[PDB]
Structure 1
């Protein structure tokens, strides 16, 4: 619509590296509205339900261990085309091949340490949102700048 939402998670590395404010600000600058925000230490269950599509990927184990190893900053951003757009702002999986100006392109080197998670579709955003936030955690009242939308 224009009320599309995405699930973004600043991974433990990213939190550790003090990149939280920097990530949020990129999205705030873009004109996306923060409709949900929290810091938590993901549980094994959440992590596994989160990355369930990767269940049989050789890095799963490590992935799940790492995401649960420290605080994660989870958030939901709402705005027109926010899913595909947050995905672009992030870069690609490998932070080395990520274009400069992208979050990963500017701050990571290693795949295992690629700082942020972003939902890759409306479907998965919807699913991840529900997984990480209770609807009472999410705003109903959205108001970005009127200067953003026609």
Structure 2
């Protein structure tokens, strides 16, 4: 039983030119790229993405940092929602475990390179927000017999 999660490379990942390295970490585990799109995030879409934080004092500055190119992604794998969160590490890079993306690349939570859905409900909501269903692709990895039990 595989699932799908929404992962988004933030403008710092684009500008620091580590997109390929990020994607490689997920491919390395045999996670399948089900969707991928470069866009420029705008305030209106970011307000929906961060709807839970509406009205909080940090939100305007967060939206400013996130207004920029982003890489929208859907990855598929066993337990991939929780596993992608583990691979990213703590939101605060100083707290993140060695070997996680945030510990390996970042210093502060406001520039922490990447977002991943925190739950199945948020993955469904985020995938619907950032992608049209047409953009989710169905295919099977040829190495499946050696990735899955």
Q: Corresponding residue for 1:95?
A: 93
- Backbone CA RMSD of aligned residues: 1.1
- The 4+ residue runs of structure 1 with deviation greater than 4 A are none
After TM superposition, the score normalised by the length of structure 1 is 0.94
**128-137 or 50-59, which deviates more:** 50-59
Correspondence list, 1:61-72, <5 A: 61-68=60-67, 70-72=68-70
Which of these residues, 98, 113, 116, is aligned with residue 115 of structure 1? Answer: 113
Q: Corresponding residue for 2:84?
A: 86
Q: Corresponding residue for 1:6?
A: 5
Shift of 1:5: 0.4
Question: What CA distance in whole angstroms lies between the structure 2 residues aligned with 1:58 and 1:111?
Answer: 16
- Describe the SS at the equivalent of 1:120: coil
Residue by residue, what CA displacement relative to the aligned partner does 1:47-78 show, whole Å, maximum 9, x if unpaired? 1100111113321111111111x200110001
Shift of 1:143: 2.6
- Describe the SS at the equivalent of 2:34: strand
After TM superposition, the score normalised by the length of structure 2 is 0.95
| Structure 2 unmatched runs, 5+ | none
Total equivalences in the alignment: 148
